[PDB]
């Protein structure tokens, strides 16, 4: 088990926006009847809309930097961004409970945008490790990605059983057999496909920097570098800052 | 609070009064050197050209309007009633489709 | 009370800005800014605290190595300076006022200029995201026109980051309004350049900026008509965001100018792109519900990306000439590549109307093509390694048993 | 930098700045929001205001934004040499009046490119060449000749005549469109109905 601390790793955190896989619900006729602007909305167009996914890092319910958009990319039959966003924040400046909000947007009319979803996935998961691989976050509908702690739009909650076991397989903790796992893995793929299909919500896929300039084998871990006398005195010998303030002023 | 605020000489005074009167009547500040005058003259000629061009464009537009007539109110009312009937029938059809 | 704050709290907050942890520095700056805004009286000893203790004290945070400190300073500069100015008024009820005002103005101006030319781009974008038009009072009309605007016009040179150009187009309106019309001629070519940018969201932001500046009355009349003549083609752009920003700008212009101006200039420009004549131009809906269909994205991207764009447009205009009766016939192209590319485009079903729309968009296409070509720690890790050890123990026992 | 020889026109067109200094607050020592309004002057009347500066909050020595060409060349008779300055002061959207000056720009004394005041309830103006306050051979060139001056005057007169004719034609075209406006109401109703019908058909 090899790892590099978050404090030492001084680069920009990068995130890949994959494909928003799901089905998008529409309104009734009366809604467009009362508000004709819905006809020209993005959702009411026959082809997939040109959505763009903003991203902002939060911490303790406080925004940590400006959001980052996705470069314009046309869509014909699917939402496949496959873009490597660069985040303003760096690894040593991410607090423990940092969480990345990701909001989808769509046109509503001249000079207006309307959120078409929202997801919030923690960066430092259990055991204080930076989440890696290809995680498929959930999509809460018609709500901007909420950054408050605890989040009101969480990303990730027998599918759970197989999620844990697959991890233990590739971390070396499992019995060794070739054909059996070669078939079982396709089985899990089909099971996950069915589970995703059944779920009514959308699901936005996302990937972290599993492969970087350094060996992929390493992982990131949260880290930081911080009877003569009985009655305590915690400032016995320091500078009198008020004295200095008065001396400097006049 | 409130507050308030000999021939050579004759010809010089005449010129000064003329300059003050011109400055008061117009928006150009007299007097002016010949380079300033030349630049100002060029600018004024260009402005006159632009203004005359705009006047000609307005004349053309007034002509095109003169060619036009005013539409009848009866036909517009008939079209409005037809559109209202169309809207009502469309609403009924939409409700039927929703129920189905 | 105020005196308690000034005597006992501020000299300790200033000491927390000189800490090792960058987050501590940012938090110290935020708390120092919040605390000082509470003061409403000036003790006799605190007559001149701002220009001698606080502003010099937090000066080093404009050049700190970590980007979080610089972001904090860029976010809190607008509010700190404004509290300084209000502080001087309180002392007045108690050195000429004008000289002190000038000194404070110079300090603020220098720090703003220092922030606007930092290596990172997030710092620059934040300075404009929270009070770039506010500090425009600490510069003046002439100093802003010769320093602030000059530094903001060099952001459009960066061809590797469209976020910065978008930020400039978003925040230029306030500075343009403050600096007056003496800057109108400067920003016209820059706005024209933006509307032919490689990244399309930059075009959207430029259209929004044009609309905003046209609503406040900051555009000359001929410049307004020129921009209307240049933006009319966008009503048939394949992209939707631009196809709506153009509508917004055109409606705003139709509202601003007089009725005769609208009927004389705007409508003749809009004739090709509206299926039927309209009356309620200022209403957005009556304009959107009349526009013709756009140019399908496939043909647009095939025509724009293909090399030798000039010959393609030459032959397209020759075919248009033939179709309009200008010439008796359309001769075949000289270059076989142009013929093959025209065949490919025509196989996608590009309609004659699509050819007309492509030709009307030619100016935007060529400029866009050339530009595009050039372009909590120890315990957490203890738990993690304990999980690793448990998993490895189970692993080895199970494998050995197998 | 103001050469003090006469014939230097000093009108409202050259004036772009205004400020106040040492305003006395009658209701205690509280600092007051301020904003000024400028008026035309006459022996019989003090006309309505034609300017209104943005509100400067928490200040007794305001320095408002520069007023280019007075209110910009928009039917403003910027050649008037006399005008009146009024200053409003108060807090929380309730405002009183505290200053009233009838200033002829010619009588203003010159100070050097730096605002300075010494009397309470004062206003300091700013022209092209600097700031004015209340009163408590090798470099020579050739001037235009009479013929060129006549040509310049005539060009200005022609410009103004054509502008007046343009305004006349504009009013005429607006009037012609006005008569059709009655039918334009029915046409607007028809347009709205057609748009809604299109939406309904698509849905």
Gap between the Cα atoms of B30 and C213, Å rounded = 35
**Which pairing describes strands D94-104 and B2-4: parallel, antiparallel, or unpaired?**
parallel
Q: How far is the CA of C93 from the CAs of C220, C271, C399, D31, D117, in angstroms?
A: 45, 64, 85, 9, 16
Nearest-Cα distance to chain D for B92, in Å, is: 11
- What was the structure determination method? cryo-EM
**Residue C123: how many CA atoms within 13 Å on its side-chain side?**
22
Given 3-state DSSP classes, what are the helix, strand and coil percentages for chain A, each rounded to the nearest 5? 20, 30, 50
C-to-N gaps above 2.5 Å in chain B, after residues: 5
Cβ neighbours of C175 (radius 10 Å)? 22
**CB–CB of C126 and A66 under 8 A?**
yes
8 Å CB contact between C214 and C224 = yes
**Close Cβ partners of C324 (under 8 Å, ≥ 6 residues apart):** none
Q: Residue C109 corresponds to which tokens in the numbers above?
A: 């101006």
Considering only CB atoms, which chain B residues are within 8 Å of A39?
none
Cβ neighbours of A85 (radius 10 Å)? 20
Q: Residue C176 corresponds to which tokens in the numbers above?
A: 């343009």
Q: Is the peptide bond before B31 cis (omega within 30 degrees of 0)?
A: yes
Q: How far is the CA of A83 from the CAs of A11, A14, A70, A206, B67, in angstroms?
A: 18, 10, 7, 10, 58
**Close Cβ partners of C283 (under 8 Å, ≥ 6 residues apart):** C251
**CB–CB of A241 and C392 under 8 A?**
no
Chain B residues 26-85 within an 8 A CB cutoff of chain D: 26-34, 37, 40-41, 44-45, 47-48, 51-52, 54-55, 58-59, 61-62, 65-66, 70-73, 76-77, 79-80, 83-84
**Which pairing describes strands D82-91 and D46-49: parallel, antiparallel, or unpaired?**
unpaired
| Span between the terminal Cα atoms of chain D, in Å | 72
Considering only CB atoms, which chain D residues are within 8 Å of C39?
none
**CB–CB of D199 and A29 under 8 A?**
no
Give the SS3 label for residue C19: coil
DSSP C9: I
D2 phi/psi in degrees, rounded to 5: -120, 105
Gap between the Cα atoms of C117 and C62, Å rounded = 11
Considering only CB atoms, which chain B residues are within 8 Å of C264?
57-58, 61
- Among D103, D144, D186, the residue with its CB nearest the CB of B77 is D186
Gap between the Cα atoms of A195 and A185, Å rounded = 15
Q: Residue C189 corresponds to which tokens in the numbers above?
A: 């070519």
The structure was resolved to a resolution in Å of 3.4
Considering only CB atoms, which chain A residues are within 8 Å of D203?
29, 32-33, 39
Q: D200 CB near a chain A CB, below 8 Å?
A: yes
Nearest-Cα distance to chain C for D183, in Å, is: 11
Which residue of C lies nearest to B50 if distances are taken between CA atoms?
C222
Gap between the Cα atoms of D134 and D102, Å rounded = 11
**CB–CB of D203 and A36 under 8 A?**
no
**Residue A9: how many CA atoms within 13 Å on its side-chain side?**
22
Residues in chain A: 250
């Amino acid at each position: 088990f090899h790892y590099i601390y978050s404090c030492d790793l001084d680069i920009n955190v990068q995130l890949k926006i994959g494909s928003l896989e799901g089905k998008r619900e529409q309104k009734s006729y009366k809604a467009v009847l009362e508000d004709p602007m819905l006809k020209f909305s993005g959702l009411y167009q026959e082809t997939c809309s040109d959505l763009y996914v903003t991203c902002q890092v939060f911490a303790e319910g406080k925004p940590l930097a400006l959001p980052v958009r996705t470069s314009y990319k046309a869509f014909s039959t699917r939402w496949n961004w496959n873009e490597w966003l660069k985040l303003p924040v760096k690894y040593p400046d991410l607090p423990r409970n940092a969480q990345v909000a990701l909001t989808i947007w769509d046109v509503y009319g001249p000079g207006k945008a309307v959120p078409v979803g929202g997801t919030t996935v923690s960066l430092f998961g259990k055991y204080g490790m930076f989440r890696q691989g290809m995680h498929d976050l959930k999509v809460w509908p018609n709500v901007e990605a909420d950054g408050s702690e605890p989040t009101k739009t969480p990303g990730r909650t027998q599918m759970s059983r197989l999620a844990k076991l697959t991890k233990a397989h590739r971390q070396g903790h499992m019995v060794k057999v070739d054909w059996l796992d070669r078939l079982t893995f396709r089985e899990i793929e089909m099971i996950n496909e069915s589970e995703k299909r059944s779920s009514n919500f959308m699901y936005l896929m996302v990937e972290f920097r599993c492969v970087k300039c350094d060996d992929k084998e390493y992982g990131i871990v949260y880290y930081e570098k911080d009877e003569l006398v009985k009655v305590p005195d915690p400032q016995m010998s320091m500078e009198n800052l008020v004295e200095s303030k008065h001396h400097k002023l006049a | 609070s409130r507050r308030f605020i000999e021939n050579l000489s004759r010809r010089l005074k005449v010129t000064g009064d003329l300059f003050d009167i011109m400055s008061g009547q117009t928006d150009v500040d007299h007097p002016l050197c010949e380079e300033c005058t030349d630049t100002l003259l060029d600018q004024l000629d260009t402005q006159l050209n632009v203004t005359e061009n705009e006047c000609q464009n307005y004349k053309r537009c007034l002509e095109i309007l003169e060619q036009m007539n005013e539409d009848d109110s009866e036909q517009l009312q008939m079209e409005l009633k037809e559109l209202a009937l169309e809207e009502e029938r469309l609403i009924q059809e939409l409700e039927d489709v929703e129920k189905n | 009370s105020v005196e308690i704050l000034l005597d006992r709290i501020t000299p300790y907050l200033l000491h927390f800005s000189n800490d090792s942890v960058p987050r501590v520095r940012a938090e110290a700056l935020r708390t120092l800014t919040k605390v000082l805004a509470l003061v409403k009286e000036v003790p006799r000893n605190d007559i001149n605290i701002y220009p001698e203790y606080i502003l010099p004290g937090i000066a080093h945070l404009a050049q700190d190595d970590a980007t979080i400190v610089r972001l904090a300073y860029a976010e809190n500069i607008a509010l700190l300076a404004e509290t300084a100015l209000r502080f001087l008024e309180l002392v007045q009820l108690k050195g000429n006022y004008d000289t002190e005002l000038q000194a404070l103005h110079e300090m603020v101006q220098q720090k703003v200029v220092t922030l606007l030319s930092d290596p990172e781009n997030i710092v620059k974008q934040t300075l404009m995201e929270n009070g770039i038009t506010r500090l425009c009072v600490f510069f003046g009309r002439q100093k802003a026109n010769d320093v602030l605007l000059s530094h903001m016009i060099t952001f459009l040179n960066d061809k590797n980051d469209w976020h910065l150009r978008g930020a400039f187009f978003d925040s230029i309106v306030g500075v343009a309004a403050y600096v007056g019309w003496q800057s109108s001629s400067i920003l016209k070519p820059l706005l024209q350049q933006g509307l032919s940018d490689a990244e399309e969201f930059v075009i959207v932001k430029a259209l929004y900026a044009l609309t905003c500046m046209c609503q406040l009355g900051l555009l000359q009349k001929p410049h307004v008509y020129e921009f209307a003549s240049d933006i009319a083609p966008f009503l048939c752009h394949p992209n939707l965001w631009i196809r709506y920003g153009a509508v917004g700008f055109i409606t705003v212009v139709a509202r601003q100018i007089s009725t005769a101006d609208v009927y004389c200039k705007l409508m003749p420009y809009l004739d090709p792109y509206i299926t039927q004549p309209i009356i309620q131009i200022e209403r957005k809906l009556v304009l959107l519900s009349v526009l013709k269909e756009p140019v399908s994205r496939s043909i647009f991207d095939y025509a724009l990306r293909s090399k030798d764009i000039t010959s393609l447009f030459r032959h397209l205009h020759m075919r248009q000439k033939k179709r309009n009766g200008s010439l008796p016939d359309c001769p075949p192209p000289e270059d076989p590549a142009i013929a093959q590319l025209l065949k490919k485009l025509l196989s996608q079903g590009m309609t004659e109307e699509e050819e007309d729309k492509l030709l009307a968009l030619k100016d935007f296409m060529m400029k866009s093509n050339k530009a595009k070509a050039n372009i909590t720690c120890k315990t957490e890790l203890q738990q993690l390694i304990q999980q690793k050890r448990e998993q490895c123990n189970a692993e080895r026992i199970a494998k050995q048993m197998m | 930098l103001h050469v003090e020889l006469p014939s230097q026109q000093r009108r409202l067109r050259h004036l772009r700045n205004i400020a106040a200094r040492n305003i006395v607050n009658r209701n205690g020592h509280q600092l007051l929001d301020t904003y000024f309004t400028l008026h035309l002057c006459s022996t019989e009347k003090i006309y309505k205001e034609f300017y209104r500066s943005e509100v400067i909050k928490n200040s007794l020595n305001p320095t408002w934004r520069s007023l280019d060409f007075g209110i910009m060349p928009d039917r403003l008779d910027t050649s008037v040499s006399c005008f009146v300055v009024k200053i409003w002061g108060g807090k929380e959207n309730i405002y009183q009046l505290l200053i009233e000056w009838k200033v002829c720009l010619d009588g203003l004394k010159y100070l050097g490119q730096q605002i300075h005041a010494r009397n309470q309830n004062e206003i300091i103006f700013g022209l092209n060449d600097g700031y004015y306050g209340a009163p408590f051979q090798n470099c020579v060139r050739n001037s235009y000749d009479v013929f060129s001056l006549l040509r310049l005057h005539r060009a200005q007169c022609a410009i103004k005549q054509t502008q007046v004719t343009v305004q006349k034609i504009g009013k005429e075209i607006e009037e012609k469109l006005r008569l059709t406006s009655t039918s334009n109401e029915l046409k607007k109703k028809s347009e709205c109905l057609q748009l809604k019908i299109l939406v309904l058909q698509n849905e």
